[PDB]
Copies of this chain bind each other. A is one copy, B any other.
Amino acid sequence: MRIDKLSLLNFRCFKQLDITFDEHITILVAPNGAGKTTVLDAVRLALFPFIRGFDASLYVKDKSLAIRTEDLRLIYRQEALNMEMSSPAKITATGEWASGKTATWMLDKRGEQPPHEDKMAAQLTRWGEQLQKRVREEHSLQQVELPLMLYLGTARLWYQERYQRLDNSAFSRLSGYDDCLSATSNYKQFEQWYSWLWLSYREHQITQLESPSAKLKEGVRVQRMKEAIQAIQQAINCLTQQVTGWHDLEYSASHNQQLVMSHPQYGKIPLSQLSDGLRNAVAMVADIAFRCVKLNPHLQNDAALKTQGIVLIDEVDMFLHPAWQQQIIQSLRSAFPQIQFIVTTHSPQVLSTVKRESIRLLEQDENGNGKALMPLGATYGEPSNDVLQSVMGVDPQPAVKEKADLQKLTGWVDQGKYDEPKTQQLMVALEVALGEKHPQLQRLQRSIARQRLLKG
């Protein structure tokens, strides 16, 4: 499944908006407001009709998975007492469901009336229902492959502490959609399933060792367990190993029944005792990895490398340091090379690692009209300050007390009047205030030398 375009109308922040998405990775950048969260929420709402067809619906009473009366646009006018709503609120999406199957579906809401959807939105539920039907007829030789939908919000690390099988069955396969678009943490689901997986692997290994007469039947159960573990560990390594050195997440009973990681020089330490960025990244990658493994068990090792779907991440570079920020996107693309990623960030280090066609800059005018444009200049491989000033419009020189004097000195020196006593006094004052090794002062000295050389 893929989404090519999205258009909003009278939604939370935008009177209207049109935004297209790259095929593999898209990054949303916004200096002011909450436009990025609004776009992510709209996309998440547009994907729910598909999940609704698998019995995964508001059975836990998830009211955020539909357009609410709080999602409509309210205009406050100072000179008038009353305040009205903008109706209807609409979400229109274009994309692809299966190979060669292009569609366009819409969701709308009028005032306090219940939300309504058109006929293509119903066909999107019919497709999920027929996929479920094909999954439940396991007495077949053909294989059906399910897509992935996932949402990762900023609250994915808030209350990690509050809260099994793996086979080719409908019940086991459809557990990969459980709370897939939820806004809360999903860490304990993973921890319990991974603990069961490791314990079953070890117990079946010893059972096979003590009586291998059941080879042709039970030695493939252990092989499946090993292949699942290998896929998950490889996916996590792709992100953690090169930067931090930690690798091979496991479950250890001798460490008080905890998940542990290994380091060449620090040994085995429980994950709960590692740094914030490491825990964040591990949770983020593990979510996708085991959902991929549970959805498509017939892809033993290549479950993550051959799975298709859409993943949404808000603040992808949370808690990561600048050296780690320069490698997160490529790590994600290498771990899951068939998934469409839509992320948000405000870090020049991340923006310097993608091409300008994968960046969208969001802005509004006074009346709520929105625009999602590309950067005017190249960003791929450029220095961080270039991206910071050219794209985000921030001067790399901080606004310290001496900035205005520096600008005045630059303007005076570059225009030929550098031998005047006033200019020299300002020069010496700024040298003592900022030091003689300041790059701007150094290039001003170079400019003075060049101008002196020319006059000859």
Contact = CB atoms under 8 A, between A and B. Distances in A.
Nearest to A314: B276
Q: How large is the interface on A (under 10, 10 to 19, 20 to 34, 35 or more residues)?
A: 35 or more
A7 interface: no
A301 interface: no
A60 interface: no
Nearest to A77: B267
A79 to B, nearest CB: 5
A202 interface: yes
Contact of A434 (B37, B267, B380): B380
A210 B366 contact: no
Nearest to A171: B83
Contact of A211 (B254, B266, B352): B254
Nearest to A402: B381
Contact of A81 (B228, B320, B400, B438): B228
Contacts of A323: 31, 392, 394
A75 interface: yes
B74 A168 contact: yes
B366 A381 contact: no
Q: Max chain B CB contacts within 10 Å: which of A33, A75, A111, A256? A: A33
B392 A322 contact: yes
Given A83-B267, A202-B206, A205-B209, A384 B381 contact: no
Interface in A36-87: 37, 70, 74-76, 78-87
A326 B399 contact: yes
B398 A326 contact: yes
Contact of A254 (B221, B349, B383, B388): B221
Given A32-B275, A244-B33, A398-B326, A200 B269 contact: no
Interface stretch (A18-26, A158-166, A415-423): A158-166
Interface of A: 12, 31-34, 37, 70, 74-76, 78-87, 111, 135-136, 138, 154-155, 157-159, 165-166, 168, 171-174, 196, 199-200, 202-207, 209-211, 214, 217-218, 220-221, 224-225, 228, 244, 252-257, 262-263, 265-269, 273-278, 315, 319-324, 326-327, 346-349, 352-353, 366, 378, 380-386, 388, 392, 394, 396-400, 402-403, 433-435, 437-439
18 contacts: A12-B273, A32-B321, A34-B276, A37-B275, A76-B255, A76-B263, A79-B220, A84-B135, A154-B276, A202-B209, A205-B206, A210-B254, A214-B262, A322-B346, A326-B394, A383-B385, A383-B439, A386-B439
